[PDB]
Amino acid sequence: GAPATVTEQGEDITSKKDRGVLKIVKRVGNGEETPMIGDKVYVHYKGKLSNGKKFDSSPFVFSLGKGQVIKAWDIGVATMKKGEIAHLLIKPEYAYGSAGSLPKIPSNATLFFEIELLDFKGE
């Protein structure tokens, strides 16, 4: 499954190289430029828990690197070009950790997302 391909062949995009955020590009974007901390970002995504028990999907907007999303998003989206689509697999430490966000997210949950980056302007 899409998840498994990531956790076998997926690029480790953490600074610490702790494999906590793994990424595959599924469709390539256009331009050299990827967004900077503080940009307004516009994406479509779908998402699931590894548990298979909860699913979620978006025109989703957030300010990159401003902590409005999970650390994995701030890391993962910043590596994306306009019009790109990618798969992120994420360990709990770059998501909702040991505490989780009950009841939606349990303790120590792993997450998978599919993300298309549409546009980012400056703030």
Ligand X SMILES: COc1cc2cc(OC)c1OCCOCCOC(=O)[C@@H]1CCCCN1C(=O)[C@H]2C1CCCCC1
Active site residues: 45, 55-56, 70, 96, 113
Kindly state the smallest distance separating residue 112's Cβ from ligand X, in Å.
Answer: 8
Kindly state the smallest distance separating residue 27's Cβ from ligand X, in Å.
Answer: 19
Shorter beta-carbon distance to ligand X: residue 105 or 117: 105
- Over the range 17-41, which residues count as b (16 or more CB within 10 Å of their CB) and which as e? eeebbbbbeeeebeeeebbeeebeb
- Alpha-carbon distance 8 to 12, whole Å? 11
* 8 A C-beta contact, residue 108 and residue 39: no
| 45 lies in the site for ligand X, by CB under 6 A | yes
Lay out the site mask for ligand X across 54-83 (x = CB under 6 A, - = otherwise).
Answer: x-x------------xx--x----------
Strands (E), the chain: 11-12, 21-27, 40-49, 55-57, 60-63, 85-90, 111-121
Shorter beta-carbon distance to ligand X: residue 29 or 111: 111
Chain residues binding ligand X by CB under 6 A are 45, 47-49, 54, 56, 69-70, 73, 101, 104-105, 111
